[PDB]
Amino acid sequence: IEEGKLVIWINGLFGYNGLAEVGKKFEKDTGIKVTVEHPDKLEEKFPQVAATGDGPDIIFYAHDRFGGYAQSGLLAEITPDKAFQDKLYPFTWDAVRYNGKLIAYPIAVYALSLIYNKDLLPNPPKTWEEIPALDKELKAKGKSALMFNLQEPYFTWPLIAADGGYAFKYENGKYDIKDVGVDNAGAKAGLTFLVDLIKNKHMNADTDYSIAEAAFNKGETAMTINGPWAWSNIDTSKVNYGVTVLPTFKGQPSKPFVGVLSAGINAASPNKELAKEFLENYLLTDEGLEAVNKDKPLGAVALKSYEEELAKDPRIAATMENAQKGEIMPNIPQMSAFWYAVRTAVINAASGRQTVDEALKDAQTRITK
Numbered sequence: 001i002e003e004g005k006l007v008i009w010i011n012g013l014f015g016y017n018g019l020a021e022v023g024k025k026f027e028k029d030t031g032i033k034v035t036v037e038h039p040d041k042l043e044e045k046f047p048q049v050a051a052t053g054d055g056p057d058i059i060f061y062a063h064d065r066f067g068g069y070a071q072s073g074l075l076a077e078i079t080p081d082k083a084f085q086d087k088l089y090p091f092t093w094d095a096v097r098y099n100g101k102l103i104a105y106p107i108a109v110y111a112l113s114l115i116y117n118k119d120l121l122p123n124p125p126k127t128w129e130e131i132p133a134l135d136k137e138l139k140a141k142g143k144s145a146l147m148f149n150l151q152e153p154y155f156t157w158p159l160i161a162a163d164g165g166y167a168f169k170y171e172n173g174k175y176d177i178k179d180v181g182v183d184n185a186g187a188k189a190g191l192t193f194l195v196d197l198i199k200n201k202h203m204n205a206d207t208d209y210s211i212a213e214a215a216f217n218k219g220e221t222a223m224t225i226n227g228p229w230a231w232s233n234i235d236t237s238k239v240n241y242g243v244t245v246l247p248t249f250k251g252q253p254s255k256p257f258v259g260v261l262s263a264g265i266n267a268a269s270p271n272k273e274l275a276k277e278f279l280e281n282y283l284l285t286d287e288g289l290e291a292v293n294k295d296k297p298l299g300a301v302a303l304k305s306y307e308e309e310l311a312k313d314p315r316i317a318a319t320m321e322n323a324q325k326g327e328i329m330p331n332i333p334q335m336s337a338f339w340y341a342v343r344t345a346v347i348n349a350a351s352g353r354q355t356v357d358e359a360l361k362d363a364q365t366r367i368t369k
């Protein structure tokens with residue numbers, strides 16, 4: 001890491017170009033060059049490189065990955081004063097607190113919502129159970145009912161947790177890493193339904209982010225599941241779409257895992273003062289957030305002043321409604337294991353290489369091993 005400049009990493013799904021614009025205003029005003037990159041699998045890359053003393057000066061990613069980094073001493077403790085802390089909703093601050101210490105700056109809160117084509121389906125389904133019949137019906141027009149990324153468990157987890165599945169129970173003031181619910185009845189029921197949709201051919205196990213996006217933006221599928229970041233391309237496609245509550249399962253709401261996009265500062269960085277200045281005085285301001293938000297919508301931002309101007313947007317109201325029905329992700333070091341195990345379980349169950357029961361049993365065992 002070079003002293004006198006800022007290198008930032010952020011998930012390619014978000015508005016990295018919008019974040020670069022903020023970096024340019026910073027450079028103009030300060031003279032410091034800000035380089036924004038979106039490396040592949042940055043959440044796994046950062047740990048590796050940061051452990052040797054390099055990597056970016058600032059890393060932007062969902063808060064669930066940060067506990068792992070902090071435990072490894074890869075994050076500098078941020079030092080925001082009371083006046084600044086008061087500018088962001090306190091619940092977003094709790095999302096980046098680890099071991100009684102703040103390890104990152106909250107930027108935005110997001111969750112998945114059901115997105116549907118108003119012209120193909122005026123009244124979206126309130127339940128998962130009615131999608132199969134609805135799909136067959138749309139097949140009589142060469143169209144499908146629902147397409148969404150089945151490769152990443154973040155997308156399928158809302159259904160799995162609906163009837164009772166869960167990661168780590170939060171109890172006694174902390175996350176119980178032995179009390180895991182990926183192999184219970186609730187979780188099995190939800191994944192069995194998903195896998196049935198795939199085997200019965202209402203969905204294809206190969207559907208990924210590209211497939212689902214192209215299908216919905218070309219009006220070939222009535223619905224999709226995605227986050228705020230996808231709204232930009234949908235607007236560009238001209239689809240008359242709506243953003244609403246995820247359907248229910250066995251009479252219960254789908255429970256999406258709520259993520260808080262956070263900016264953490266590399267412990268090995270020689271530009272910690274500059275990082276703080278950029279985040280607190282350039283990014284986390286109405287101006288900075290609007291810049292990023294106009295690139296790719298962030299969802300409900302942590303900045304109270306700006307969030308008030310965004311709250312009006314019904315798409316954001318829908319995001320929050322889904323978020324309140326779900327659960328803020330835990331940020332413990334074991335989350336990496338949870339995601340890896342679940343990602344594998346869903347993939348094997350969906351590809352036939354394993355029965356739902358097997359898949360989940362193995363994920364559960366590996367998560368608590």
Ligand SMILES: OC[C@H]1O[C@@](CO)(O[C@H]2O[C@H](CO)[C@@H](O)[C@H](O)[C@H]2O)[C@@H](O)[C@@H]1O
Binds near residue numbers: 063153154
């Ligand atoms: O492709 C998944 C997409 O979802 C996010 C939402 O924050 O990641 C979440 O889900 C992953 C598994 O699907 C986890 O590995 C990750 O830690 C979690 O935040 C995005 O970051 C990601 O691009």
Ligand SMILES: [Zn+2]
Binds near residue numbers: 132136202
């Ligand atoms: Zn069917």
Ligand SMILES: [Zn+2]
Binds near residue numbers: 206208
């Ligand atoms: Zn693919």
